[PDB]
């Protein structure tokens, strides 16, 4: 199997878990759950959502 990464939060996606979304510019996004999927559809920036890997990498928290 392959363990994919969340396109919004960077969480690990196990097989059969979450959803996938193909945008009209032929780019693939993978969501581990409906929470990150709905934040993506609400167009929030993952750099400003405090629990994401990209936020913690930006803010040097636990790095």
């Amino acid at each position: 199997m392959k363990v994919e990464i969340d396109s919004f939060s960077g969480a690990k996606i196990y097989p059969g878990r979450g959803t996938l979304f193909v945008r009209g510019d032929s780019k693939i996004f993978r969501f581990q759950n409906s929470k990150s999927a709905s934040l993506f559809k609400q167009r929030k920036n993952p750099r400003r959502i405090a629990w994401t890997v990209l936020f913690r990498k930006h803010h040097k928290k636990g790095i």
Partner: protein
């Protein structure tokens, strides 16, 4: 006049009456056909439904578009402690059917099986099978005359067995007792096997093995009184309907001047005994073993229990059967697993199955992690961890 447009009948007429079952343990109405050549073995087993999970396996179907490719499938887990053999019974065959003639019990009966013979256990002198054990502890006098009676008569031998409810996380303390048919050897060999196995435990791998197609017999989940729309699946009436719309409009013609039995009506939904056939065993797990949830490809020592335990059930410290798909009944319910009544080739019942990965994430939410070590490695250190 005739019905304007044809449509199939709502519901199945062979599953009537849709009443509540007589007991919470469903009856095995038929056992596999005996042949007197195989060794003496049981035809079925008892377990408790624990819950469901997913696996990933590599499909082997030579001709499918998903041949030699990974698929993810839903399996359900049945917790099966080793069952305890107490008692055998023989059935002679009469022109009015099968009829039991004697029942010979084991000597020492445990408290969890003799709680079955009581409604108020806490206020009792516990006098059960005391004079029967007094019939024992002679040499043999009142015992092998009934055993030789079962040998001389009794064309069908069945074994009384009972679960070990105290090994499970259930709070019941009162074991389930059942009859399981023996399907090997002659009548004398059957009763000799039973006499040797009095007060002894039989494990689940002695009766089942991997890639075996089996049947699940259980009472379904109860739902109480239900309207006709969800109980039978009839079409909802339109919105501007006076006096309600979750109904059947015409419940019969003028003649015959009675409501027919075939008209869908409201009543009890669920809690019916069902037998679902052709479920393949993927794993016969051993409870005396770590890395139950590990495969040859995953190889991380984790048990079959998910994070936080099975929801509403608990732990799987005993042996278990991983079986493909859905079985009737909800969690914490007694379920009888039975061998197949016929030999199925089908190029699907003969498929050899080797698992790749078993899901052990939490079912009490959107679980991200399979093991607490993996969760700690991903999240780093926390405030509570110093």
């Amino acid at each position: 006049s005739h019905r304007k447009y044809e449509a199939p009948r709502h519901g199945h007429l062979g599953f009537l009456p849709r009443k509540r079952a007589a007991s919470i343990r469903a009856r095995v109405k038929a056992f596999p056909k005996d042949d007197r050549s195989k060794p003496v073995a049981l035809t079925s087993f008892l377990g408790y439904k624990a819950g469901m999970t997913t696996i990933v396996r590599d499909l082997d179907r030579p001709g499918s578009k998903f041949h030699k490719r990974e698929v993810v499938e839903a399996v359900t887990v049945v917790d099966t402690p080793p069952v305890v053999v107490v008692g055998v019974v023989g059935y002679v065959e009469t022109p009015r059917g099968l009829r039991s003639l004697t029942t010979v019990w084991a000597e020492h009966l445990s408290d969890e099986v003799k709680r079955r013979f009581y409604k108020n256990w806490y206020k009792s002198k516990k006098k059960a099978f005391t004079k029967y054990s007094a019939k024992y502890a002679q040499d043999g006098a009142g015992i092998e005359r009934e055993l030789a009676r079962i040998k001389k008569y009794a064309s069908v031998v069945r074994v009384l067995v009972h679960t070990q409810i105290r090994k499970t996380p259930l709070a019941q303390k009162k074991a389930h007792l059942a009859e399981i048919q023996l399907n090997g050897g002659s009548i004398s060999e059957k009763v000799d096997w039973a006499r040797e196995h009095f007060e002894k435990t039989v494990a689940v791998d002695s009766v089942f093995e991997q890639n075996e197609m089996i049947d699940a017999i259980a009472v379904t989940k109860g739902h109480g009184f239900e309207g006709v729309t969800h109980r039978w699946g009839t079409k909802k009436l339109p919105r501007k309907t006076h006096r309600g719309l979750r109904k059947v409009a015409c419940i019969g013609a003028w003649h015959p001047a009675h409501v027919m039995w075939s008209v869908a009506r409201a009543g009890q939904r669920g809690y019916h005994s069902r037998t679902s056939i052709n479920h393949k065993i993927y794993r016969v797990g051993k409870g005396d073993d770590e890395a139950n949830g590990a495969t040859s490809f995953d190889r991380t020592k984790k048990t079959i229990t998910p994070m936080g335990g099975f929801v509403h059930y608990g732990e799987i410290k005993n042996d278990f059967i991983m079986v493909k798909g859905c079985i009737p009944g909800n969690r914490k319910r007694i379920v009888t697993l039975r061998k197949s009544l016929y030999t199925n080739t089908s190029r699907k019942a003969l498929e050899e199955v080797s698992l790749k990965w078993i899901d052990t994430a939490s079912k009490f939410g959107k679980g991200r992690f399979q093991t607490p070590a993996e969760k700690h490695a991903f999240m780093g250190t926390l405030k509570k961890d110093l």
